Amino acid sequence: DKISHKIDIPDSAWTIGIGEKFKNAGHPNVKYPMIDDSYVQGAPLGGFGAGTIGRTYNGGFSRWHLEIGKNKYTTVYANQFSVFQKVEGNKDGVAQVLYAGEPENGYLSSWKWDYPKESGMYYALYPNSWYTYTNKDLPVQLAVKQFSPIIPYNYKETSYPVAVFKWTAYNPTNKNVDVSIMFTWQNMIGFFGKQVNVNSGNFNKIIKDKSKDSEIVAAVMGNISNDNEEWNGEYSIGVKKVPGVDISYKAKFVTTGDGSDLWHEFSKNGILDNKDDETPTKQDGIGSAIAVNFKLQPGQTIEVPFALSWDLPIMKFGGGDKWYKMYTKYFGKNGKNSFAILKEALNNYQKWEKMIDDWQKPILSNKSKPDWYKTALFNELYYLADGGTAWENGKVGEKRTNNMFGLLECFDYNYYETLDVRFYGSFPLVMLWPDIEKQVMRQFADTINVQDSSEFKVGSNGAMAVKKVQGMIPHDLGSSYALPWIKINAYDWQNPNIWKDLNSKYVLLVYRDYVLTGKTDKEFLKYTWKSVKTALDKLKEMDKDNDGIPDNEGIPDQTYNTWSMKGTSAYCGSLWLAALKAAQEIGKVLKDNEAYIKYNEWYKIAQQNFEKELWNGEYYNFDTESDHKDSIMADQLAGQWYADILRLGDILPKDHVQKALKKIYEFNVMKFENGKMGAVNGMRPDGIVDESDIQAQEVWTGVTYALASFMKYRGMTEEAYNTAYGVYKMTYDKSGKGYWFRTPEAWTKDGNYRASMYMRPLSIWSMEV
Ligand SMILES: OC[C@H]1O[C@@H](O[C@@H]2[C@@H](O)[C@H](O)O[C@H](CO)[C@H]2O)[C@H](O)[C@@H](O)[C@@H]1O
Numbered sequence: 114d115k116i117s118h119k120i121d122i123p124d125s126a127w128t129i130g131i132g133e134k135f136k137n138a139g140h141p142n143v144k145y146p147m148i149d150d151s152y153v154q155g156a157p158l159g160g161f162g163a164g165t166i167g168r169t170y171n172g173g174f175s176r177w178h179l180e181i182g183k184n185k186y187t188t189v190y191a192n193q194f195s196v197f198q199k200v201e202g203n204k205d206g207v208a209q210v211l212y213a214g215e216p217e218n219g220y221l222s223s224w225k226w227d228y229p230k231e232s233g234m235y236y237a238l239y240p241n242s243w244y245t246y247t248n249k250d251l252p253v254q255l256a257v258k259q260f261s262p263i264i265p266y267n268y269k270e271t272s273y274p275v276a277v278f279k280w281t282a283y284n285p286t287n288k289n290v291d292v293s294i295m296f297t298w299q300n301m302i303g304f305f306g307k308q309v310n311v312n313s314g315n316f317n318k319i320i321k322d323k324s325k326d327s328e329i330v331a332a333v334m335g336n337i338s339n340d341n342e343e344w345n346g347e348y349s350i351g352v353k354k355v356p357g358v359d360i361s362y363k364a365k366f367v368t369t370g371d372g373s374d375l376w377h378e379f380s381k382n383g384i385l386d387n388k389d390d391e392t393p394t395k396q397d398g399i400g401s402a403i404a405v406n407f408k409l410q411p412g413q414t415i416e417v418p419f420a421l422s423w424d425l426p427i428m429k430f431g432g433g434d435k436w437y438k439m440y441t442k443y444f445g446k447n448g449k450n451s452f453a454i455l456k457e458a459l460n461n462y463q464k465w466e467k468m469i470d471d472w473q474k475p476i477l478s479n480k481s482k483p484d485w486y487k488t489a490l491f492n493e494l495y496y497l498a499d500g501g502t503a504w505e506n507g508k509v510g511e512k513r514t515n516n517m518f519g520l521l522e523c524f525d526y527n528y529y530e531t532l533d534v535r536f537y538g539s540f541p542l543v544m545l546w547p548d549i550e551k552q553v554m555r556q557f558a559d560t561i562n563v564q565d566s567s568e569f570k571v572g573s574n575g576a577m578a579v580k581k582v583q584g585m586i587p588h589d590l591g592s593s594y595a596l597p598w599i600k601i602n603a604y605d606w607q608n609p610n611i612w613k614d615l616n617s618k619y620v621l622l623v624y625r626d627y628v629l630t631g632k633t634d635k636e637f638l639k640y641t642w643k644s645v646k647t648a649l650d651k652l653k654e655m656d657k658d659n660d661g662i663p664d665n666e667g668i669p670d671q672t673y674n675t676w677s678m679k680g681t682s683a684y685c686g687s688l689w690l691a692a693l694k695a696a697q698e699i700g701k702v703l704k705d706n707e708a709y710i711k712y713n714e715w716y717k718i719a720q721q722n723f724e725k726e727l728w729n730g731e732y733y734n735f736d737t738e739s740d741h742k743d744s745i746m747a748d749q750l751a752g753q754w755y756a757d758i759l760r761l762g763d764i765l766p767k768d769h770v771q772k773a774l775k776k777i778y779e780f781n782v783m784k785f786e787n788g789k790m791g792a793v794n795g796m797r798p799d800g801i802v803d804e805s806d807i808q809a810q811e812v813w814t815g816v817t818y819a820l821a822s823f824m825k826y827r828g829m830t831e832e833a834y835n836t837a838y839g840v841y842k843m844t845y846d847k848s849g850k851g852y853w854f855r856t857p858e859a860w861t862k863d864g865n866y867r868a869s870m871y872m873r874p875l876s877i878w879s880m881e882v
């Protein structure tokens with residue numbers, strides 16, 4: 114490996130061998146069908162709300178999130194980079210697809226597949242990823258840096274449906290070598306959203322944009338139809354000329370054939386036919402190819418950028434609504450703008466690299482923090498783009514000031530912005546994209562007093578329940594299968610209108626969002642204040658026994674939705690205390706004296722009784738009325754965790770909080786698989802995992818990272834990082850279960866998982882508060 118020195122990969126990048134087989138991979142531990150796309154994954158490409166594309170460590174474009182809210186794992190084999198090399202003096206060169214695999218049928222059989230093992234590495238530090246190619250049959254060593262411009266405090270480039278591939282080629286040998294790099298792409302119009310005639314009308318055109326010191330050559334792969342529909346738009350691939358390279362192209366090769374129309378050209382001398390051909394296809398799949406060829410002398414390095422864009426302006430949800438995607442603000446809505454997007458990237462990618470470096474540098478340069486922590490901190494952010502992210506710029510046929518946003522809970526449980534989850538998972542948004550975060554919370558504010566008295570069948574018990582109760586915060590803002598933003602509470606497995614954590618978590622999120630954006634946004638507090646008061650006032654009505662605290666009902670009625678709480682719980686109780694303290698402080702800021710007094714009175718009563726009911730001398734009991742009420746819950750003081758972040762002070766005595774956190778580390782972490790797998794949710798006081806429900810026996814990745822942040826704030830530095838380390842290890846390490854770029858909600862002691870690609874572990878960003 115002589116190429117690594119010619120590029121700049123951070124030491125904290127996650128690494129794996131190209132073509133590496135992973136032997137320890139976990140699988141779902143549930144009885145019901147659940148997504149398992151295996152461990153062949155990579156960091157995604159694409160902006161927020163753009164649709165994303167997962168290019169895996171083996172090189173394939175395989176995890177398709179272009180249909181917003183859907184996960185489709187299938188390798189489109191025509192989409193590749195390939196290389197040709199010929200040593201000066203030799204009669205023949207070699208050509209190789211840079212993909213560690215081969216197609217499953219006979220399409221593209223002429224191409225040279227099966228990039229060999231032990232011949233290159235993949236690296237990722239989101240939003241960047243890299244491949245290096247160090248192959249005994251390729252004398253010139255190559256590397257590529259690929260990324261999209263995901264940039265904190267930037268709502269423009271961060272939305273773009275674009276990727277850059279910055280190639281570096283170096284000749285360490287003593288002979289001249291001719292080298293070509295070729296990007297192939299299938300015209301994927303009709304891959305989704307089209308009910309018949311999936312390739313019909315697809316056609317490819319070549320754009321040559323020549324100006325002074327700028328030559329771009331690109332293929333635009335579109336359809337003859339000018340219809341404005343979810344399926345229609347354009348893909349583009351292209352390259353920018355640099356000194357010492359020549360560009361060649363082929364407009365049209367058949368992807369549903371053996372590929373020799375292209376490969377007989379590329380494999381001879383790495384130079385394509387430059388054949389334009391705008392003939393639309395009928396049934397055949399078609400694709401385009403863009404190549405560069407250059408001669409490298411001994412010791413010479415060359416850099417050359419390629420790009421990919423996709424202009425698919427319309428997202429459609431299963432309930433029928435069609436929306437424009439956010440990036441259309443910057444490029445237009447007609448779906449004929451892929452070249453403009455590509456050109457912007459090829460002319461500005463160096464600026465974008467610097468902008469990414471500028472935001473990663475404060476963390477990467479901090480030599481007090483271990484590299485593993487940096488690996489997880491940046492790579493968990495993959496989910497912000499890869500979580501079915503929807504970001505609208507108008508309803509089709511509709512202008513408003515704001516752009517509504519939603520991130521999925523996950524794909525298995527297809528609900529936008531699930532609030533009990535976003536309490537943990539929204540840290541990156543408030544910290545890095547706060548205008549999105551505040552927009553989401555206004556979306557929730559607007560739902561508080563919505564009443565939908567139409568009844569739905571509850572999945573878990575078959576009862577009928579009201580869809581949405583006035584004054585109760587919704588579980589979610591809809592499903593991609595139905596109507597995001599319009600029809601809330603798509604979750605129907607249980608009735609969220611009786612949950613005891615949603616209304617408190619809502620208030621805590623509101624005040625968090627004020628505090629972590631500098632305590633200056635009084636307008637945001639004003640917008641949300643009525644909803645805050647309503648939410649707490651409704652929750653107060655659920656106090657059955659007048660101890661000042663809402664009663665859990667002995668059926669799951671909170672985020673641990675199979676782990677029943679009854680009476681006063683540490684979890685819902687502490688969240689309630691913190692929410693009351695938050696509302697007092699908002700009352701003070703907004704000069705609402707009567708609200709301040711009321712919530713102060715409720716707080717003092719509830720605080721006294723919480724302590725009396727639950728403090729046992731070592732930790733806070735799980736609850737007051739359950740069969741294993743004395744279980745040690747990892748998340749028992751979630752309200753105090755948030756109170757620390759919100760600078761609300763002590764809701765419980767410092768001594769008791771410290772004792773409780775030490776007990777959780779000693780038991781839920783260190784007595785669970787030697788503290789190498791995170792914090793198990795429930796442990797009995799005898800040091801045996803609580804078996805009352807599956808959730809008690811799970812580690813929740815997002816709960817564990819949040820607990821680590823709580824420990825860190827409380828000065829338990831070693832315990833914090835040791836607790837988080839087990840989550841990192843399981844997700845990323847060779848000794849773990851292969852969950853990189855699909856971090857799950859949960860695992861059990863055997864390492865098997867529930868709900869890959871989950872929002873909650875974005876809570877790792879609470880460790881950066
Ligand atoms: O892991 C806890 C989270 O569980 C989620 O519930 C899932 C449902 O959404 C899905 O429809 O069904 C499965 C199987 O019954 C549930 O696990 C909730 O959406 C989250 O609120 C909850 O925290």
Ligand SMILES: [Ca+2]
Pocket residue numbers: 655656657658659660661662663664680681
């Ligand atoms: Ca009560």
